[PDB]
Amino acid sequence: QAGIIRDLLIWLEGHLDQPLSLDNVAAKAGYSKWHLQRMFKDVTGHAIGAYIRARRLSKSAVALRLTARPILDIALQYRFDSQQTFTRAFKKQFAQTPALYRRSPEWSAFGIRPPLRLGEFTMPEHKFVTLEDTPLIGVTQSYSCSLEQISDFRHEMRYQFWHDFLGNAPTIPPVLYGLNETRPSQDKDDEQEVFYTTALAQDQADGYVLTGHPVMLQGGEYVMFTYEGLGTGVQEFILTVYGTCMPMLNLTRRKGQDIERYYPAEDDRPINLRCELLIPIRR
Amino acid sequence: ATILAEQLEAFVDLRFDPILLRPVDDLELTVRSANCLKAEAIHYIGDLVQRTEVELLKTPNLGKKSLTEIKDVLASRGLSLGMRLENWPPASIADE
Amino acid sequence: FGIDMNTDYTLEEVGKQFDVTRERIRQIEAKALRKLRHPSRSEVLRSFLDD
């Protein structure tokens, strides 16, 4: 029934990584390989099999653009069979060499396919802004981790950076700023590295003796992706803006520091904080 | 005195399967075999080993490959279909 | 890699051995990392990781 396929994807989005799966492994869900396939074709509007390995490639495409691994870390990482075939289907999805794909800093959402929900989808809102060059102060440190660890690692990089400064802060600055960077290589254009900078705001307290650099925020077009959810919910909100809202709003984010705008002004209950993801956008 | 007293008492005195701890959602079965069984209000493995398979699989959320995980899991641990237990439920047992 | 040898055989010297191939024979080694990445075998080699 309609309660099945929705629950299958809660398995499948969580088991798009771990089992080396075709529809035979997916045939352990109540019915045969064809009837579970027959039950998917009409309740969704997508056709399951060539979609999933492409969605697993769409899970690998953001791994090909924002994760710091070479071609053969991610050759058969997402349960594939070969690399040249993986390179082949990539041409029919993005029309670009994967060496050329991580050569350019611009990341356009052409072939990324959003994660499917049979239930009700939590749609985020958008508002297109154009921002200003603002000085701040903050430190940087790096990571090399998973797609699900795009905010699991990122929780500590703001917290110990904040609670070192709060030991010598007579105030609480209520506007937070976080900056993600995609910087490729020169030897072979398949790799990159990421330096993440959270910063303290130049606000009503003039004396801010913080280790780091005076960072001028990048100017140009931006988007006010305001949100309601806890820092563990920005984990899936970063994934539903970057897995979905760049394809489903068909937009191409531009080269530069992705401005995060958290709110620490509501800092035990689980805190339902409000946050904006001001992406530097080229519309 | 007391420290001397107690040291004198050297000579005056001196001469259950752990996977049955878990509910139905806590066994890591196949594509739909673990989350579907809780919908029949079966909140435990001990509550699920008390019944037979004839009154489970026919609900049209429960399927033929939501059926067989009662056949092999009890065979890997040595239980029966309809086994009523004495002390199955834990201290604070509930549902989600 | 040069275990148990004096010289180290290259993918063109290998290129006549099993096949003309230069990608999938490298992708044989891509299976060789991948069949040893799985964290039960890679932990004897984690003792020498301290460099």
Topology:
This is part of a larger assembly, with chains A (283 residues), B (96 residues) and C (51 residues).
Chain A: H1 2-14, H2 33-44, H3 48-66, H4 84-94, H5 98-101, E1 107-108, E2 128-131, E3 136-137, E4 140-142, H6 156-165, E5 177-180, E6 183-184, E7 192-193, E8 195-201, E9 220-223, E10 226-228, H7 233-242, E11 252-253, E12 258-261, E13 274-278, E14 281-282
Antiparallel strand pairs in A: 1-11, 2-9, 3-8, 4-8, 5-8, 5-12, 6-7, 10-13, 11-14, 12-13
Chain B: H1 2-7, H2 45-48, H3 69-77
Chain C: H1 24-34
In short:
This is part of a larger assembly, with chains A (283 residues), B (96 residues) and C (51 residues). Chain B is mostly helical and 96 residues long.
Kindly describe this structure.
Chain A: Transcriptional regulator. Binds to the right arm of the replication origin oriC of the chromosome. Rob binding may influence the formation of the nucleoprotein structure, required for oriC function in the initiation of replication. Chain A: One of its GO terms (cellular component) is cytosol. Chain A: It holds the Pfam family HTH_18. Chain A: One of its GO terms (biological process) is regulation of DNA-templated transcription. Chain A: InterPro entries: AraC_E-bd, GyrI-like, Homeodomain-like_sf, HTH_AraC, HTH_AraC-typ_CS, MarA-like, Reg_factor_effector_dom_sf, Tscrpt_reg_AraC-type_HTH. Chain C: It is found in: Cytoplasm. This is part of a larger assembly, with chains A (283 residues), B (96 residues) and C (51 residues). With 283 residues, chain A is of the alpha+beta class. Helices cover 28% and strands 16% of the residues of chain A. In chain A, strand 6 and strand 7 form a beta hairpin. The longest helix of chain A is centred in the first third of the chain and has 19 residues. The radius of gyration of chain A is 21 Å and the shape is globular. With 96 residues, chain B is mostly helical. Chain B has one domain: DNA polymerase, domain 1, CATH 1.10.150. The longest helix of chain B is centred in the C-terminal third of the chain and has 9 residues. The radius of gyration of chain B is 24 Å and the shape is elongated. The termini of chain B are far apart. Chain C has 51 residues and is mainly alpha-helical. Chain C is 22% helix and 0% strand. Chain C is built from one helix and no strands. The longest helix of chain C is centred in the middle third of the chain and has 11 residues. Chains A and B meet through helix 1 of A and loops of B.
